[PDB]
Design a protein around this ligand. Sequence first.
Ligand code: BTN
Ligand code: BTN
Lengths: 308, 307
Amino acid sequence: KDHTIPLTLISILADGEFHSGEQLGEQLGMSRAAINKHIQTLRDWGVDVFTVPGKGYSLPEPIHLLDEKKISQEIDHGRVTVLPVIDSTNQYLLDRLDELTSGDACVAEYQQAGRGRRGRKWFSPFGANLYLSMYWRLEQGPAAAIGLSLVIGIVIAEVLQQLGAEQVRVKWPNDIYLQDRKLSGILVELTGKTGDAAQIVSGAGINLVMRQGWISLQEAGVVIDRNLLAARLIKELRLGLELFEQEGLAPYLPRWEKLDNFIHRPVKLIIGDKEIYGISRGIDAQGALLLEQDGVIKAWVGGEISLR
Amino acid sequence: KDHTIPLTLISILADGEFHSGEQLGEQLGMSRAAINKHIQTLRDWGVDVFTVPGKGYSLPEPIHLLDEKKISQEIDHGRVTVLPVIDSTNQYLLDRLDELTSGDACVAEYQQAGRGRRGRKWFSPFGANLYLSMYWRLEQGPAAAIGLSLVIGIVIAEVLQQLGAEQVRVKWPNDIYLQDRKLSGILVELTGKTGDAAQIVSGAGINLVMRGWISLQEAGVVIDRNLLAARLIKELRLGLELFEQEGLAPYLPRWEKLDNFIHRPVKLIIGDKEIYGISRGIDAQGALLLEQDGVIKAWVGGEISLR
Ligand SMILES: O=C(O)CCCC[C@@H]1SC[C@@H]2NC(=O)N[C@@H]21
Ligand SMILES: O=C(O)CCCC[C@@H]1SC[C@@H]2NC(=O)N[C@@H]21
């Protein structure tokens, strides 16, 4: 049944402040007697309404109304948007940083300008692979994005493992590997201030279809509906990040050890155009890379790990 | 830029079947030459399209497109609907049983015809208390709804405990209590077949404001209604799915900590009958264990009251 007028009426009084029959009549476009009549319906609904005689109405105390969007977000800790065509899922969230909350996600079917790490281009054919991005605000500094990327790699690799691909491994600071071949590229981008929060948009591109250095989930004997895989990743990533927010990197230290593709192996550390050679010894308790050169282990807080 | 036509083209070709430029022109309302040109736009997007003379265009293999509702459904296992005015949240779900999946929920601000267990009426004033309902299909029989109700009671009391009401207790088979006063009424209704599944719509009305009954306001506990509803729906979905795969075993110790009437003189009411004894909790299948004259017997029905 149409209850539009009483429902609009209660939303104007939900603040608990004083509301005059004249102002109500202006907003609702109704007479003062009819405004009173629709106040009368509300009291028949069990709403306590105070009637100041001749001046207007007020609620005893402010009331907060039910909202689908508010309820869903607390259920979800984030929204999801599907884009058929976009330049990049990372760029879509980056363009809307002022309006995002931690957990907001974004999946695309086709990326017109998918981006890699070093200015590389991510080939994103329509409806073939997964092109996902999610936003997260870290109250810790921009240096917390290292743990961000490490947690993301652990979560993504774990989710793939529960779906069949038991030999999926991670790469410091962000990539997913399988049989020493790149299966998914992660691109974590950040704008922040030291001593303050950091807004992070992380984007994952997972090779699902085959089309020497690259591998696909099809080549692993794993076939998944993209909607199911995307939903599982968004759900698990959201849970992993809030755990990282409240407990830090400590829960993920044993998990990184089980998943590191390059631990105790000869690797290449890439910073700028430099190339540092050594044996990887995992990560430290703060997510810094532990790289052994000539028997000496030094901690690195930046760069990329490569194969040798 | 407008990408409607290439996107409509790919949704028409996503089946993997053959589609002739004539058929495409009919659906797309476009010429045959322009259809061919926009086929090329799809190929510039990395879509494999075969141009077979005399048969049509086709994708090499059927492709499955991304859907927001499908993705959201797996993230949530259930949707949520807020209704400003409705007769009953239980009735809303019951009217739509053919379209519901386990976890679908329903919150109302005002219920015109609130419903109790034995046909009494739940007074549901607008924007005062929580009027929530959820659907669930149990693959086990209708007798599994007793464990359903027990899990629902445990979850709701647990959620309330984490929000401040640390002394909230449960009642067999379904009610929420506080200081031996009714704090929330649960109405679990079901339709099923023995030896088959049962569709269950459970509805909880939680007294939040003061107007034998107790409210969360009277306990010094204030919760945002949006926050309480969201937490309940999440925990109920998680709790019910755990019950689906592990049974009542995880909840047996949890029920004991929350039973308001265990080891107390109680009244078992079935119909107009009154059976007297001391409650000794529940069994592993959710049946009430009632001690009368030193003998503990399991009951599969009725309501527990106080004496
Ligand atoms: O290997 C790399 O350098 C990172 C590649 C990241 C690719 C994904 S596709 C989803 C998201 N959107 C982008 O533009 N990039 C990432
Ligand atoms: O104590 C009882 O007999 C059960 C009361 C159940 C009340 C709730 S309010 C939400 C849902 N909608 C209804 O009509 N009833 C339940």
